[PDB]
């Protein structure tokens, strides 16, 4: 019986491939063929944030657009003041094998996790004056690959055991488990209203989830290698995806396919990070060729490079007001561009 | 830094940078060793001194005023490619092989680790455990069962030396050395064998840092 039903699954996949074929009226390239280009985006390094000893794996901005956390494998989590380069806090971690970090949108909490399969929540406003661990969420079976706050009581974590999870920080238990990827989930990105989120995995697949429901709504399959980076468009109706085959792609949640492809023949190394500018006209992508490229997100031109790092650009981020871009890297420095 | 509160904030920032450097000095005098055995070999048993810290397990000991840190990642059953760059900066890899089904699996693992793009310049210490159990089952079960191209007389002196050649033939890089030592698994000698081999890595690292080969 199991062969006959997957035989029906083979034609049921043919239906959704034909519905994607039926909706393909015109390319996004020929629709945007007449609008003016962005020109040439030249940014300069404003700050350089020195003080990490080992290499930097993650950074996240605060919603006030001034403070930022960075994680590194010397075992320290450092909160920076980006305007003055001051170190506000330095949090010594238990396990120095950290791969992700997050800022709460309130500003009171900071999360981190990695090869210990634990998402630790740190309280910043203590009334004793020191940063301490408020909860360490332990239910994943693989390494923690990403974590994002919904509010101060809910966090969504990605993991390498092919599973995303929704937690309750008050009680410290999983609320909703998101299964369906066959490879390790390497990244996730929240929708601006935080009702959906996308997650890209090692089986070259992206999946659109539903937070209060718990189901997979859409599956997007265009890449040929492992997806490392994902980011939502600012209005929440598209997302961008960067993978190891040196390609970014723009998918859209309403037409259920890919729109544009961002690739160059000189580019042979994989994307580590992507983010969008505040209008969604630029797409910044961090690479293993040690620099970042700015892509015209609507015409797929490459307009600008951010080349200042001696090693691989591991993380990347744009502020909420849209002023600065911070890129961290394996040469143990963060920079800020404008 | 003009304000009275901007002065005291900058004084706090400088106090953090000093404590960050005092931690980077204490941690740089550490030897980090990555344990990469296959399944159950001898990796969790070669750690003579047990001072621990499912995730990642770290055991540490000190030997001749030198502090060793051993990172087992056997419980990380994920895709190995994703977290292998975390250990790019270790001194050596300690590979354990059980000589007593898991033989060609251990070789294909060793081919992946030795030819990794992060593990060129990273030398390997190859232990070969349980030679006290390899010594008698070779009398009952010859090496032509698993290695069919073995053309030797089925002697423990050269069956163990032929298997050692099968691992060292995967090297394919001159910038890294494979040290090798057949552990009896009843030996209080693995602390010294690691210590003698780590010294030869540090000398050859210093010859590379002084521009002298």
């Amino acid at each position, epitope marked *: 019986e199991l062969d006959q039903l997957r035989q029906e699954a083979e034609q049921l996949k043919n239906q959704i491939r034909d519905a994607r074929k039926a909706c393909a009226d015109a390319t996004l390239s020929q629709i945007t063929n007449n609008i003016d280009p962005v020109g040439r985006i030249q940014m300069r390094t404003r700050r350089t944030l020195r003080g990490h000893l080992a290499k930097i794996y993650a950074m996240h901005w605060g919603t006030d657009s*001034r*403070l930022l956390v960075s994680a590194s494998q010397d075992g320290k989590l450092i909160i920076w*003041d980006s305007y003055t380069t*001051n170190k*506000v*806090h330095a949090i010594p971690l238990r396990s120095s094998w950290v791969m992700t970090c997050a800022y709460a949108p309130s500003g009171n909490y900071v999360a981190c996790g990695g090869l210990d399969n634990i998402c630790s929540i740190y309280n910043l*406003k203590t*009334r*004793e*004056g*020191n940063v301490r661990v408020s909860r360490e969420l332990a239910g994943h079976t693989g390494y923690l690959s990403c974590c994002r706050f919904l509010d101060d009581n809910q966090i969504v974590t990605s993991s390498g055991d092919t599973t995303c999870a929704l937690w309750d920080i008050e009680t410290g238990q999983q609320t909703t488990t998101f299964t369906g990827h066959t490879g390790d989930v390497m990244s996730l990105s929240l929708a601006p209203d935080t009702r959906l989120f996308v997650s890209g995995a090692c089986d070259a697949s992206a999946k659109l989830w539903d937070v209060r429901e718990g189901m997979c709504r859409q599956t997007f399959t265009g890449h040929e290698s492992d997806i490392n980076a994902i980011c939502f468009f600012p209005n929440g109706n598209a997302f961008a995806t960067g993978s190891d085959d040196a390609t970014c792609r723009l998918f859209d949640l309403r037409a259920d396919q890919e729109l544009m492809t961002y690739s160059h023949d000189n580019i042979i190394c994989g994307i580590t990070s992507v983010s969008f500018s505040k209008s969604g006209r630029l797409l910044l992508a961090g690479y293993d060729d040690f620099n970042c490229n700015v892509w015209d997100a609507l015409k797929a031109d490459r307009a600008g490079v951010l080349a200042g790092h001696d090693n691989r650009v591991s993380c990347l981020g744009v502020t909420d007001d849209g002023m600065a871009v911070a890129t961290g890297s394996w040469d143990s420095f963060l920079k800020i561009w404008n | 830094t*003009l*304000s*009275a*509160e*901007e*002065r*005291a*904030a900058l*004084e*706090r920032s400088k*106090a953090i940078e000093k404590n960050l450097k005092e931690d980077g000095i204490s941690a740089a005098k550490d030897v980090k060793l990555l344990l990469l055995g296959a399944d159950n070999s001898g990796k969790s048993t070669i750690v003579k001194q047990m001072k621990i810290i499912t995730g990642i397990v770290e055991t540490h000991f000190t030997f001749k005023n030198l502090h060793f840190r051993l990172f087992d990642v056997g419980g990380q059953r994920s895709e190995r490619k994703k977290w292998i760059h975390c250990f790019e900066d270790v001194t050596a890899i300690i590979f354990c092989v059980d000589l007593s089904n898991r033989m060609h699996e251990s070789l294909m693992l060793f081919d992946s680790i030795c030819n990794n793009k992060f593990f060129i310049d990273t030398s390997i210490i190859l232990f070969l455990n349980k030679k006290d159990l390899f010594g008698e089952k070779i009398k009952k079960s010859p090496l032509t069962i698993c290695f069919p191209e073995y053309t030797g007389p089925n002697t423990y002196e050269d069956a163990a030396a032929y298997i050692q050649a099968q691992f060292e033939s995967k090297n394919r890089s001159p910038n890294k050395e494979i040290y090798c030592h057949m552990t009896c698994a009843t030996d209080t000698n693995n602390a010294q064998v690691i210590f003698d081999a780590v010294t030869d890595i540090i000398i050859a690292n210093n010859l590379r840092g002084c521009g002298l080969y």
Partner: single-chain antibody
Amino acid sequence: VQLVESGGGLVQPGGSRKLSCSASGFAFSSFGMHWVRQAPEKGLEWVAYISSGSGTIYYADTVKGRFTISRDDPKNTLFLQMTSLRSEDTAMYYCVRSIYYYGSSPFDFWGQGTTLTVSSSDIVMTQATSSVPVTPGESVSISCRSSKSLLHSNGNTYLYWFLQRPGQSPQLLIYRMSNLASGVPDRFSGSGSGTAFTLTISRLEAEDVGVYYCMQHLEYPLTFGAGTKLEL
């Protein structure tokens, strides 16, 4: 979190006395500490300051030369060595903690007081009103005025508000001219202009009766305002 001070009593003038302040319940090594005294019927008056790690020490110019502040981070104590005691040093001395980074709340916990009884270029903060007759439920507005603009080029206006209930130590209400402190209700509010500042209470309750001070933190020495008392 608590601070408890000891070592106050009747002292002959010209002599000496040591004041101790032992801290319990917080990471004492990362807070800077202040001494603030209160004359037997007058308002608050800043005395000394030691930072975290003792790398910065300031004194009031009244006591510069004859008082010495010091801290013991292994024992979690604070010291004020007082020499050449005049009869103007009869006061009640408060031990205040304050931590400084971006977005913090300085001057947020105050000690209990020691009664020391000696035998017998600055910025001036002006609270010209000194007494208002107040009824509960009504709307109060306390106004403070400065002889220099407390607004800085960074954007902050370093003006703080404190409330001292009858028989208690002061307590921070508003920090940096608009920020409501943690633990105080939402009915307090602060507005400013750079030179004139206002504290508005929306509806009065019985837990708001006391003396209201304004402080500046733009530059040292820190100068309080005179007391604006609220009564029934």
